[PDB]
Amino acid sequence: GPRPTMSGATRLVQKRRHGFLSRVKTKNGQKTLKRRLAKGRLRLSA
């Protein structure tokens, strides 16, 4: 079954992993933004 994996989770690790700068500055991150931007998402990251 699922586990409580978000216990003790901080919001500084959310910007370093799934933030916006982590995606525009990486080759594989531009795809995610372009993919999410083509679908029409508002929340491109974090």
Partner RNA sequence: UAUGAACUCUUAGAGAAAUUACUUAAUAAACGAAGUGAAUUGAAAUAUCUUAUUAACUUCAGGAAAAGAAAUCAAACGAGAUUCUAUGAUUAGUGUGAACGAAAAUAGAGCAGCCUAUUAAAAUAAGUAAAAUGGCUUUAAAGCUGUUUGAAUAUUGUGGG
Partner RNA sequence: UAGAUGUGCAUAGUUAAACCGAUCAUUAAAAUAAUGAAUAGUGUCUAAAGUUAGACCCGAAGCCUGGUGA
16 binds RNA per the rule CB under 7 A: yes
Pick one of RNA, Mg ion, none as the site partner of residue 8 (Cβ within 5 to 8 A by kind): Mg ion
Q: Which residues contact 38 (CB under 8 A, 6 or more apart)?
A: none
Binding RNA (rule: CB under 7 A), the pick from 3, 7, 11, 40 is 11
Please identify which residue in the block is written with the tokens 């916006």. 20
Pick one of RNA, Mg ion, none as the site partner of residue 6 (Cβ within 5 to 8 A by kind): none
Cα radius of gyration rounded to whole Å, the chain: 13
21 binds RNA per the rule CB under 7 A: yes
**Contact predicate 42/20, CB 8 Å:** no
> Interface residues with Mg ion (CB under 5 A)?
8
